[PDB]
Amino acid sequence: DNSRYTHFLTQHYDAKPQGRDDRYCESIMRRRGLTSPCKDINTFIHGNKRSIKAICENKNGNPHRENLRISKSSFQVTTCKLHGGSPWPPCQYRATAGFRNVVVACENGLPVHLDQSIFCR
Numbered sequence: 001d002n003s004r005y006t007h008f009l010t011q012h013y014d015a016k017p018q019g020r021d022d023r024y025c026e027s028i029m030r031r032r033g034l035t036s037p038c039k040d041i042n043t044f045i046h047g048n049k050r051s052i053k054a055i056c057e058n059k060n061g062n063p064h065r066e067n068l069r070i071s072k073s074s075f076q077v078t079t080c081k082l083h084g085g086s087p088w089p090p091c092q093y094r095a096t097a098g099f100r101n102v103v104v105a106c107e108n109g110l111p112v113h114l115d116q117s118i119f120c121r
Contacts, residue, residue: 002108002110004107004110004112004113005107005110005111005112007112008104008110008111008112008113008114009049010032010033011032011034011042011114012042012043012044012045012114013044013045013049013052014028014044014045014046014078015046015047015048015049016046017044017046017078020078020095020097021095022092022093022094022095024078024095025078025080025093025094025095026091026092026093028044028080029042029080029091029093030091035089035091036088036089037087037088037089038082038086038087038088038089038091039080039082039091040081040082041079041080041081041082041116041119041120042079042080042116043077043078043079043080043102043114043116043119044077044078044079044080045075045076045077045102045114046075046076046077046078047075047076051073051075052075052102052104052111053109053110053111055069055070055071055102055104055106055111056069056104056106056109056110056111057109060072060073061106064103067105068103068104068105068115069103069104069105069106070101070102070103071101071102071103071104072101073101074099074100074101075099075100075101075102076097076098076099077097077098077099077100077102077119078095078096078097078098079095079096079097079098079119080093080094080095081093081094081096096119098119100118102114102115102118103115103117103118
């Protein structure tokens, strides 16, 4: 069963994003179902899927902390951070685009979790 991988892609993958500004964040967070209630922080990885899956192997990854994996390559990413006091929609997001390696957890050679702690600031 690979539903967690599918869910990883829904929450954390966007191949070819359209301008990574606040309005990008506000739209994709709605489109991916992450606005009821408003997710506090969420990061999307860009580029191709095969590079992300490779983090699960020696090809593009190293072990990290307690049973996570950290990528060797750097990825284009965009972090969407909720602002305003309210947990409920409409959800306003601030976008932060970036370029660095990423931390995931893998199961059966597929990523199933993105460690959001490296994108908090």
